[PDB]
């Protein structure tokens, strides 16, 4: 309860950790820890009745986040872990269910069959992109096929529980915390041309309420990099 890091403080009360490993450390690299280990809280999204989903590409969502966005634009490469806290607060009179996964290497498929999706339609820096529940038309400029029942990656959406995940069921549970280590082939990769994680939130059982309750439930995502280092002089 009320854990702090740097000059920030959030509070909790169950933690699911990665693929069984805690994130640890390894020219010679430099290891910054004093000014970056803090909880970057993204601005909250609203879960309405007919909502469909959200995704954030993870080492891109902190690209305009102040000092961490100055370590990225000064340094070519880098390897980080992550620690995500998702918590939505509804009353005892709301009902629904979320699925909070964290997909490594989530290559997405374009709407047009011949091209590839462009940069702005894949990754919104510190802003959520949204799934839909219809098909997206093909003769446009360039967009992502965001039908939610194929999860944007051509795979069945029920099978997404093989990735490290957590359910948020508003009847019993309230929050979900994940810890994700460094999952990559090369030991240090470029952070401007590679989004090595993707946090998805998919509401399976949609929201419902009676007339009079608040017609929206907000969702707060809080990311905090742990065990980060760069290669530079």
């Amino acid at each position, epitope marked *: 309860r009320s854990i702090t890091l740097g000059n920030s403080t959030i509070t909790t009360q169950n933690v699911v950790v990665g693929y069984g490993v805690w994130p640890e450390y390894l020219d010679q690299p430099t290891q910054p820890d004093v000014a970056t280990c803090r909880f970057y809280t993204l601005e909250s999204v609203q879960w309405m009745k*007919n909502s469909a989903g959200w995704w954030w590409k993870l080492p891109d969502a902190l690209s305009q986040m102040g000092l961490f966005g100055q370590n990225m634009q000064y340094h070519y490469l880098g390897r980080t872990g992550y620690t995500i806290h998702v918590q939505c607060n509804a009353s005892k009179f709301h009902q629904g269910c979320l699925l909070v996964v964290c997909v490594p290497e989530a290559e997405m498929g374009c709407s047009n069959l011949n091209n590839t999706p462009e940069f702005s339609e894949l990754s919104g820096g510190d*802003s959520a992109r949204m799934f839909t529940d219809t098909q997206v038309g093909e003769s446009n400029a360039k967009k992502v096929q965001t039908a939610v029942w194929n999860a944007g990656m051509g795979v069945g959406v029920g099978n997404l529980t093989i990735f490290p995940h957590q359910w948020i069921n508003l009847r019993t549970n309230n929050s979900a915390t994940l810890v994700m280590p460094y999952i990559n082939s090369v030991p240090m990769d470029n952070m401007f041309r590679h989004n090595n994680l993707t946090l998805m939130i998919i509401p399976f059982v949609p929201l419902n309420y009676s007339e009079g309750s608040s017609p929206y439930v907000p969702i707060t995502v809080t990311i905090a990099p742990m065990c980060a280092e760069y290669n530079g002089l």
Partner: antibody
Framework: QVQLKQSGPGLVQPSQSLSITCTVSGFSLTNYGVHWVRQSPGKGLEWLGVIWRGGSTDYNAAFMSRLSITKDNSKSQVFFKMNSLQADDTAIYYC?????????????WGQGTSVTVSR | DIQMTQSPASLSVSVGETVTITCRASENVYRNLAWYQQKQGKSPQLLVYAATNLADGVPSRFSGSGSGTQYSLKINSLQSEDFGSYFCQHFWSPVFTFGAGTKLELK
């Protein structure tokens, strides 16, 4: 929250060019695309063109050589140009943002600038 | 391209009935349809997007349904502000085409 608005000429001579500029507030141009819809009481609503959030644009087929839409991300402005302006363009002109929860529908519309092309 | 045929051209109903407006497409659009309501002398307001979902400030009187090439919009109980112009418009592929339009007199 305050939203987009536009400002144009109002009247133009035939076989000239047309220039309206739509300026937004409350959101950025790197997350939503802006459309152009022409309300004419003789032909109903018609869709002219759009510039997506990536920067690449897409126009109607019947107005390909006449339209040129552009935007600039820093100044929060768009610029669209129409030329050769025949007498069937006596209508009112709207700019409206798209991508209402990622669904490519017009969220909120401008106040509109009515144009008339006669002398 | 794809043409939208909206019917009827106008209506004359009173306050407190049900009303159904349908518009048919040329081919399949996969539920990518938006409905707008316009009053006199103003910009249109979005009513229903993607053929089922209601908008933000729109009350639950309106209801849209359909799949494939036939869609429909239903208002269960009229009020004293639901008269004006109504359009249906698809966003499947450019060129996006609007409907013909309909009117409510509220005699």
């Amino acid at each position: 929250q305050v939203q987009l608005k536009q400002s144009g000429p109002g009247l133009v001579q035939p076989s000239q060019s047309l220039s309206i500029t739509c300026t937004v507030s409350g959101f950025s141009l790197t997350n939503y695309g802006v459309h152009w819809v022409r309300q004419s009481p003789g032909k109903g609503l018609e869709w002219l063109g759009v510039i997506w959030r990536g920067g690449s644009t897409d126009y109607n087929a019947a107005f390909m050589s006449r339209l040129s839409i552009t935007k600039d991300n820093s100044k929060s402005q768009v610029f669209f140009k129409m030329n050769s302006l025949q007498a069937d363009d006596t209508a009112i002109y709207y700019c409206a943002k798209g991508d209402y929860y990622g669904y490519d529908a017009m969220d909120s519309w401008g106040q509109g600038t009515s144009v008339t092309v006669s002398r | 391209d794809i043409q939208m045929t909206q019917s009827p051209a106008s209506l004359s109903v009173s306050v407190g009935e049900t009303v159904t407006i349908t518009c048919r497409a040329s081919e399949n659009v996969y539920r990518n349809l938006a409905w707008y309501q316009q009053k006199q002398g103003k910009s249109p307001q979005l009513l229903v997007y993607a053929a089922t979902n209601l908008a933000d400030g729109v009350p639950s009187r309106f209801s849209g349904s359909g799949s494939g090439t036939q869609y429909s919009l239903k208002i269960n109980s009229l009020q004293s502000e639901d008269f004006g112009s109504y359009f249906c418009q698809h966003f499947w592929s450019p060129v996006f085409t609007f409907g013909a339009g309909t009117k409510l007199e509220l005699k």
